[PDB]
mmCIF file of C-alpha atoms in Angstrom:
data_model
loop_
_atom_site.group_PDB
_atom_site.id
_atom_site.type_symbol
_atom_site.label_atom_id
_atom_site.label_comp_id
_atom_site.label_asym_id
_atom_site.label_seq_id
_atom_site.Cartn_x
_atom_site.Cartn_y
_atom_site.Cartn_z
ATOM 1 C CA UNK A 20 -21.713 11.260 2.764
ATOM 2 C CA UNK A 21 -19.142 12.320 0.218
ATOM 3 C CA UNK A 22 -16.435 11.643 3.099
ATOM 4 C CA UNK A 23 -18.257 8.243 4.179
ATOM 5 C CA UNK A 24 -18.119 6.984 0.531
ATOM 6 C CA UNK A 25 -14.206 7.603 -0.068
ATOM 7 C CA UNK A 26 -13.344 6.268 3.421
ATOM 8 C CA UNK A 27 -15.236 2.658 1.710
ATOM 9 C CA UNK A 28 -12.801 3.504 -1.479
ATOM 10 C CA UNK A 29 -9.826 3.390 0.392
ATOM 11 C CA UNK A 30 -10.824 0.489 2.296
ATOM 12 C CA UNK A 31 -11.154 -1.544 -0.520
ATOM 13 C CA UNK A 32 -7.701 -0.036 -1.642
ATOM 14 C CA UNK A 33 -6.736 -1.066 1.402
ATOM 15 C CA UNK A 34 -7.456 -5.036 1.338
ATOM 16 C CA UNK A 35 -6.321 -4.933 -2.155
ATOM 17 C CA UNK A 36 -2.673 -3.502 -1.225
ATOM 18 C CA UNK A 37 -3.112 -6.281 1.752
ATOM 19 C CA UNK A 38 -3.307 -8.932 -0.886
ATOM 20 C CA UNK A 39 -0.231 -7.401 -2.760
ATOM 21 C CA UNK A 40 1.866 -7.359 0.100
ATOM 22 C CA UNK A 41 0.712 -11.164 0.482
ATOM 23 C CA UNK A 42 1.152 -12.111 -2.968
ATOM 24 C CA UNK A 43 4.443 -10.103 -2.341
ATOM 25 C CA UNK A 44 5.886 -12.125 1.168
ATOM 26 C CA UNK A 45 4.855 -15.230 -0.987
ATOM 27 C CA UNK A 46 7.241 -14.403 -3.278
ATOM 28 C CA UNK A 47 10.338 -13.412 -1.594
ATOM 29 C CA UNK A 48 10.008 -16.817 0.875
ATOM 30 C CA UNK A 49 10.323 -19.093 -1.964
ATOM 31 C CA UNK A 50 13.520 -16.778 -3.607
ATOM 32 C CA UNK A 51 14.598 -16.932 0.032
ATOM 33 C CA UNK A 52 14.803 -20.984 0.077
ATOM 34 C CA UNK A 53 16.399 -20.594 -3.337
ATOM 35 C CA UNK A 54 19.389 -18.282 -2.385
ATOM 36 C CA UNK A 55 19.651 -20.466 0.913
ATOM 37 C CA UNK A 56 19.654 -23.311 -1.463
ATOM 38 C CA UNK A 57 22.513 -22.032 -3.724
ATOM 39 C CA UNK A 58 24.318 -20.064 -1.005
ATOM 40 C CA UNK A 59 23.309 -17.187 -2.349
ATOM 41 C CA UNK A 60 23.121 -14.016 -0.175
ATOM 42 C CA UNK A 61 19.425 -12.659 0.936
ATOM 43 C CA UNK A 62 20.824 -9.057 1.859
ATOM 44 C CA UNK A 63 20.918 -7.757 -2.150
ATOM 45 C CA UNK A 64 21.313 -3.225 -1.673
ATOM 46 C CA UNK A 65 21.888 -3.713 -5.298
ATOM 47 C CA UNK A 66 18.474 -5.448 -5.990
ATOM 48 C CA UNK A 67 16.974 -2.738 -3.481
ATOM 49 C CA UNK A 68 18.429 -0.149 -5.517
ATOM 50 C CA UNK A 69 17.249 -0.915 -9.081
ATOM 51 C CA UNK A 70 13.632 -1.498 -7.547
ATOM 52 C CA UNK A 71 13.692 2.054 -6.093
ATOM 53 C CA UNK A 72 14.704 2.946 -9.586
ATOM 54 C CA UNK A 73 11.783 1.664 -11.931
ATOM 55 C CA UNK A 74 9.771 3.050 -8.896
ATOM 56 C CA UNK A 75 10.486 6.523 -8.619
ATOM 57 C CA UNK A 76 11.054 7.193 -12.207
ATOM 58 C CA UNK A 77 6.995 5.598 -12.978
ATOM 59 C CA UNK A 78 5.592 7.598 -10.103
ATOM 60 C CA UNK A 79 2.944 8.977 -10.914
ATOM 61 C CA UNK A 80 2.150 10.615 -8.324
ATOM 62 C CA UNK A 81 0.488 12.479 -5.710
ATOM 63 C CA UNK A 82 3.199 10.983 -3.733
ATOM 64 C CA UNK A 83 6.252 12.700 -4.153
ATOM 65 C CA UNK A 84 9.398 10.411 -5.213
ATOM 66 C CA UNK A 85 10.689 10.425 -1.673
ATOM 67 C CA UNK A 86 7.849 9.047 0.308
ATOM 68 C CA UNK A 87 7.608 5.903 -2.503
ATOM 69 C CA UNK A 88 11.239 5.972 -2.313
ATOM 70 C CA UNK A 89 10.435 5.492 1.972
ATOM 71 C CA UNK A 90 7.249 3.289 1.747
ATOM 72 C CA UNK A 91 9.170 0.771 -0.598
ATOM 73 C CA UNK A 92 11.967 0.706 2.271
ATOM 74 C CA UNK A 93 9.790 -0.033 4.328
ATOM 75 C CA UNK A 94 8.327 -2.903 2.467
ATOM 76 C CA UNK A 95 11.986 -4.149 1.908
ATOM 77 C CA UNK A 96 12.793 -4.589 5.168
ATOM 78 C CA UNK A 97 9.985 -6.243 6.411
ATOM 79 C CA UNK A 98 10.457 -8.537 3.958
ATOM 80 C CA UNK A 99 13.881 -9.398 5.250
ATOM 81 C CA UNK A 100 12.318 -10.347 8.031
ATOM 82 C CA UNK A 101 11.142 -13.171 6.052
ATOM 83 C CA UNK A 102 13.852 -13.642 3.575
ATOM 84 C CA UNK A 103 16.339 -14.444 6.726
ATOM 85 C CA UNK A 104 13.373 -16.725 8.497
ATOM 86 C CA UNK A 105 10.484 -18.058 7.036
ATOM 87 C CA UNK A 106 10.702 -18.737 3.440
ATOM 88 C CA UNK A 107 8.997 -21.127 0.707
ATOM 89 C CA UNK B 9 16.609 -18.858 -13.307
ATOM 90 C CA UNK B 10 14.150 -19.453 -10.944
ATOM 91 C CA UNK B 11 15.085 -16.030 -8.578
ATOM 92 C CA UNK B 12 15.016 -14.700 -12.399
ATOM 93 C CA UNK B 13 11.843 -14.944 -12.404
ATOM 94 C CA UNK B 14 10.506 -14.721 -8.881
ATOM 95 C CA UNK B 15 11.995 -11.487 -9.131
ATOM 96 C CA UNK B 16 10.682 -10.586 -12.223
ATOM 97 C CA UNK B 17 6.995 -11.202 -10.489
ATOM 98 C CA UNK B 18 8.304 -8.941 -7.590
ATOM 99 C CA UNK B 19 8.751 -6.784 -10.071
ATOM 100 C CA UNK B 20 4.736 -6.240 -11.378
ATOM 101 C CA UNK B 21 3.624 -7.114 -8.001
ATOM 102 C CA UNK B 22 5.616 -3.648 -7.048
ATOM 103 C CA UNK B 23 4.524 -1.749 -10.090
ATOM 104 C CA UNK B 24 1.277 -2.822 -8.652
ATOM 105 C CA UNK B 25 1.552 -1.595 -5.616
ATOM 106 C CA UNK B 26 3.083 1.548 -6.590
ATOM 107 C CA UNK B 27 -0.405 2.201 -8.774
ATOM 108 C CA UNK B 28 -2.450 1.458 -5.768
ATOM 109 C CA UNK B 29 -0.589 3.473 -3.621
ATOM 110 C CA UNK B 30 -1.198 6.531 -5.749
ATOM 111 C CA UNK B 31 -5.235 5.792 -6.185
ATOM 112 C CA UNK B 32 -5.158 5.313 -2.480
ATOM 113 C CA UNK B 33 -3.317 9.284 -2.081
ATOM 114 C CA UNK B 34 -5.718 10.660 -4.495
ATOM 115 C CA UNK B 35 -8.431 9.532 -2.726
ATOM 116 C CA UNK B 36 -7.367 10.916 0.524
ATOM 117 C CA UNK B 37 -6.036 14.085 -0.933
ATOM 118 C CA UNK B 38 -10.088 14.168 -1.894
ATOM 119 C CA UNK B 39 -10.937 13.484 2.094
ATOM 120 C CA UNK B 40 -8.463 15.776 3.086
ATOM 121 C CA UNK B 41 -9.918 18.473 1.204
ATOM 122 C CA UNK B 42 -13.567 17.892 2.187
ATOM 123 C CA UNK B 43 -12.679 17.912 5.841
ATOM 124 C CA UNK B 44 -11.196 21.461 5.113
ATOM 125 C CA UNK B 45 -14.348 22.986 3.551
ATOM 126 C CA UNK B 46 -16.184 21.098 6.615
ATOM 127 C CA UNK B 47 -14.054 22.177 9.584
ATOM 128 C CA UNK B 48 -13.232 18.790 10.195
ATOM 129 C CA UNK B 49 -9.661 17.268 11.623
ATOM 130 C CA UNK B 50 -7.434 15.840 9.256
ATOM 131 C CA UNK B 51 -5.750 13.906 11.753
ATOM 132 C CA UNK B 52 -7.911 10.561 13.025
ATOM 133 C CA UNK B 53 -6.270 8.220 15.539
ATOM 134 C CA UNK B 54 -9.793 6.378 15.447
ATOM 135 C CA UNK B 55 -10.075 5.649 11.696
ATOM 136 C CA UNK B 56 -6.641 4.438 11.607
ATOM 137 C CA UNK B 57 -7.635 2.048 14.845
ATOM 138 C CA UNK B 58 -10.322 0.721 12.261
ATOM 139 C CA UNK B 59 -8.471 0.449 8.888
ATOM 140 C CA UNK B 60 -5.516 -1.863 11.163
ATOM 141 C CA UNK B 61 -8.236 -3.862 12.997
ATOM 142 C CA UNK B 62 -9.514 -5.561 9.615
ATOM 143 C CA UNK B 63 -6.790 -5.595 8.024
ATOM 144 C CA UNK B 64 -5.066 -7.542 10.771
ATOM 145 C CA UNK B 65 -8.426 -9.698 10.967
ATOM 146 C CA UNK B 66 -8.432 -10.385 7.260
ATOM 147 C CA UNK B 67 -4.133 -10.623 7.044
ATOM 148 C CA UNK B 68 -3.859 -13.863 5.498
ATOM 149 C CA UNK B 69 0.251 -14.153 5.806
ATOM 150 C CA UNK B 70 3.449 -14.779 5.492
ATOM 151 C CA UNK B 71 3.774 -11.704 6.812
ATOM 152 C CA UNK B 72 2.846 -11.464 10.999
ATOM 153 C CA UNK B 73 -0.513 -9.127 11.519
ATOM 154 C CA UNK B 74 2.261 -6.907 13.746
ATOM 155 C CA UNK B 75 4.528 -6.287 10.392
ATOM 156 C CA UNK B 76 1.153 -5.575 8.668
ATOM 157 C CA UNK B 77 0.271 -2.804 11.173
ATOM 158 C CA UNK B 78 3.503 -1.655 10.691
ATOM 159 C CA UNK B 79 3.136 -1.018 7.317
ATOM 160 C CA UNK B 80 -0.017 0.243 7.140
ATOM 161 C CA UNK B 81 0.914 2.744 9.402
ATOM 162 C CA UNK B 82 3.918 3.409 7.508
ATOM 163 C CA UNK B 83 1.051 4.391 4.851
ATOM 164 C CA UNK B 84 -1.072 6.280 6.962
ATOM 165 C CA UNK B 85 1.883 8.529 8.246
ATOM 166 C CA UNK B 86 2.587 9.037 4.423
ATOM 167 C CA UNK B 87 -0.976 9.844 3.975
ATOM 168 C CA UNK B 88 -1.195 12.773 6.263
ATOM 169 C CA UNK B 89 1.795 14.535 4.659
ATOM 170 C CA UNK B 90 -0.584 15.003 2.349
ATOM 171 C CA UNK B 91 -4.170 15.416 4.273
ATOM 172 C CA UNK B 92 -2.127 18.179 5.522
ATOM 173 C CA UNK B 93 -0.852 19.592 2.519
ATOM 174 C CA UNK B 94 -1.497 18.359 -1.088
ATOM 175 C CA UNK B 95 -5.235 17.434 -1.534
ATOM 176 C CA UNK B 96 -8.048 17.438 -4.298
#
């Protein structure tokens, strides 16, 4: 039905945000080995910061600022957990 | 440099992201709203048991299938603060 059909929409949303987030850990490994590299720090609240910026001001929405402002967190730290171990 | 521009691609992979996060709340502000006029519960430990189990099948890495459940549920949680309130 109607419910079955946007349950398949948001699955393929889903596996697409999946692949972001992969693209995403891919990403932060290899500017991981750099900063280890060039003794750079990995911990950047400044870098954190400005993303939450161009974030919340392009929302567009239904989420409210705050939850993006959360998710993104979230997405931050568990790519520490990468940035600190494995990395490119 | 190099970070320069790994960072830049951070960058549009979390614009990205941030678009397919708000598709992904419009289309369960839709659900959420259809399971109102139908009497149905908002709240489904079983669906979210099904989203996680293929998209820790299909996780491809860096990141571990546990910080991808994580996340996802990280989503699903925001989800509901809407299923609840704001829907279509």
């Amino acid at each position: 039905e109607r419910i079955q059909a946007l349950r398949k929409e948001v699955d393929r949303v889903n596996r697409e945000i999946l692949r972001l987030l992969s693209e995403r850990g891919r990403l932060v490994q290899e500017i991981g080995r750099l900063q280890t590299e060039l003794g750079l720090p990995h911990y950047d609240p400044k870098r954190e910061e400005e993303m939450l910026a161009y974030l919340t001001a392009e929302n567009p929405g239904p989420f409210p600022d705050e939850t993006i402002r959360k998710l993104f967190k979230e997405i931050f730290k568990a790519s520490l957990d990468l940035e600190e171990r494995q990395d490119q």
